[model samples]
Target: IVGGYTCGANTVPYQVSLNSGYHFCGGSLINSQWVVSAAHCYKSGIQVRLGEDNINVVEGNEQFISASKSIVHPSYNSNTLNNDIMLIKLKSAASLNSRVASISLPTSCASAGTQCLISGWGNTKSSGTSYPDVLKCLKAPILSDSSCKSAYPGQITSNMFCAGYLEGGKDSCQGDSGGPVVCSGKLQGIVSWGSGCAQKNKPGVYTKVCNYVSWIKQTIASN
Candidate 1:
């Protein structure tokens, strides 16, 4: 989503799409058996489609779920990618409609300028591979943590946080790494890394999902 804005068909109803036969990442549908991605977009058969918009066609209000495991964040750090969150477990459940929905997490911590709501399909190419068969959005703010470590000084952390456009065009790219960044309606960030797409002070960086909400409710009550 290099500059974003082109969302429709289900208008971001808890956006998800971390598949394998395409659609690399972007997720969030935090109930009806969870999902919330980015431990570097996990990857082990990944699949969790859920009411997607235009991933190229056949959008019969999709919902291809299949993944009853995945729970990364054990202090995740692909060398400083601090607790990049992840948790997906849905070998069923998810049938909410209004297109499909679920979203609620951050009940605190999320200050600075607030204004969030990311959504994605990723890579709206500021240069090449414009990965956008549909679904794309923007609206960013939330930047503190010393303005995100003065824009990546030692690569910010506090489990991570920073939103966009510190002068950049807009952000959340690279297959929108395990997306979702809603805000007043909760969830509160996850699309994990950045330093490219819409860079001007390189804003995107997330995953501070209210500092993991007790490791996602004790890893969904001990699995």
Candidate 2:
């Protein structure tokens, strides 16, 4: 959820905080040893905190581990934000329980106009200076490909899709990049980028995860 409310600690068991000394981005646990995030979240010395709800306080369920290796999609382009997806291989596998679990990938692509949920510790306001300590969840509508194309014009690609409102006020802002977009209990997208938070007629863009399922499986197997 972009323009949403605080979520329970265990509501999203797959959520993880991408840490580069501090909480900079969000991610999802795809498996015990693998995490999925946006390629634009790249940074040196990255790590992840699993089963974390509040960014400030470390709960007993938290598992802090360094990222042994990060594999960005080979076609990712930082300039145009294409194929904005990446996978992080954990140094050690995670211990699954009620407080922490892995999310399932979508069997098929999410259709436009579907209601989806996006959650993270991102900013509450478009120009807000502070981020939330507890995880927040927002429900957004997936925009049609044609509608998304009209908004981004020539920038939209088959690898990407848009979600949120055209009228604004609800979206995944700064620090939300790399978070999950869950539709119908499946991981459908990853928060890639947006036009300055929640701007009018400008929706948050995401990396269509369904399109990369094969690649993700192949990459994990070979790694």
Candidate 3:
């Protein structure tokens, strides 16, 4: 994560590494066999690895699973980033344990000014070429929808929300796409897009998880 600190192992157990032959993005385990991530993160060789804080080394607690299928939101728009969310169904269910678990979903959207946490193995800096081996996390405050709308000029939708420091220096960068935005121990949002990492007044944008709760449940049930 950009401008964040190293997180302890298993600190964010629901966090998952989305490997498209290599570490391409981050994701969250919503269930034993389901992963939630950004639709734009899709790649041909996508796979999910759980209980892994560091990707450079093998860990006993790590569990790797091939993605049997991937389903992106039907209305996802690449240009505007509308409905930029996707779900991955694993070939096999993850065996739950202390080091691996699913994140709890929120029943309602997070309110403006709510303090939340974001974690991933994204770049350490905005212009960095390298990603951190260990997980990193930062505290971000949810920005008001009106403020976000004003910043993007009609780009921000009800399906999305914003979070980050307005003055800059804290956000999810490139490789953090699809990571979890946790508030009060619940999954509130999914890292989707932003106007350049950690830029002043350009808060990191995310897919509001609460807005698609019914869709998520229906998709899983139907598929």
Candidate 4:
């Protein structure tokens, strides 16, 4: 699944559908027992695929195994796009294989100019069709917290962060939401919102994973 004019190679992570045959972007693997992703990614009927460039070249081995249960954060607001993060707990622990291991979470906050990756099985171009299993990735720079807020002050929160081209031509669109934003191998944000597909002055927003670290641990432990 080589994107001819895509941003970069292997920057996005994704899963494919054996039935509908469409690819979708996925959040990163957080741990052997958990794969961090957005709540929306879990459709009632979709086969999960990971660790491969081409869905056509599936390795027949699931990177992580988990049954998505209810870990819906209390603060989540679907309309406002707040608290978009979710946890998919594997039935068993995952091996620490680089090809299938947990990605590190951020300790410090990402600031303006911070570069990160956004991957998904979303549209190659705005308003275009989504790729079923072909994982596509691109770079989104962290915007100034205040600048990001000013852009969407109504929906912005301490639990959220923004990224994308200030000029707005490049960004995560619809299905791209809920995926992971990785920096230095650490899980920083979960893709959430934006003004529109590849719009300038509006970068894609995401859940601040670092802000919910404690909550995630507790929720997973309880589950």
* TM-score of each prediction: 0.35, 0.97, 0.97, 0.82
Candidate 2 segments exceeding 4 Å error = none
Which scores better on lDDT, 3 or 4? 3
Best by lDDT: 2
Per-residue accuracy of model 4 over 57-126 as CA lDDT, tens digit each: 6554445243545356777677776778777665566555434446776777777788887776565566
lDDT of 2 at 22: 90
- Writing each residue's lDDT as its tens digit, candidate 3 over 1-223 gives 7788888998899999999778989999999999999999987778799999779899778999999999999999999899999999999999998889999889978899999999998877877566889999999899988888877787898899999988888888988999999999899989998888988888899999998889889999988
**Residue 102 in candidate 4, Cα distance off native in Å:** 1.2
lDDT of 2 by residue, 1-223 (tens): 3478888887899999999879988999999999999999988788899999888996778999899999999999999999999999999999999888999988899899899989999888877556889999989889999999999989999999999999998888888889999999899999998788888988999999999999999999999
**Clashing pairs counted in every model:** 0, 5, 0, 13
- Provide the lDDT at 177 for model 4: 58
Candidate 1, residues 1-223, lDDT tens digits: the string is: 8877898888888888888888888889988888888898888887798898898798588878888789897778798888888898998898897889898887688897889889888888767776778898898888888978988899887778888888887888888888889888998888888877786887888878888898898889889
Query: Which of the two, 2 or 4, has more lDDT?
Result: 2
lDDT assessment of candidate 1: 0.85
| Candidate 3 residue runs with Cα over 4 Å from true position | none
Model 4: residue 113 alpha-carbon error in angstroms = 1.9
The collision pairs in model 2 are 1-118, 1-137, 1-138, 1-139, 2-138
lDDT of each: 0.85, 0.90, 0.90, 0.63
True-vs-predicted CA distance for residue 63, candidate 3, Å: 0.2
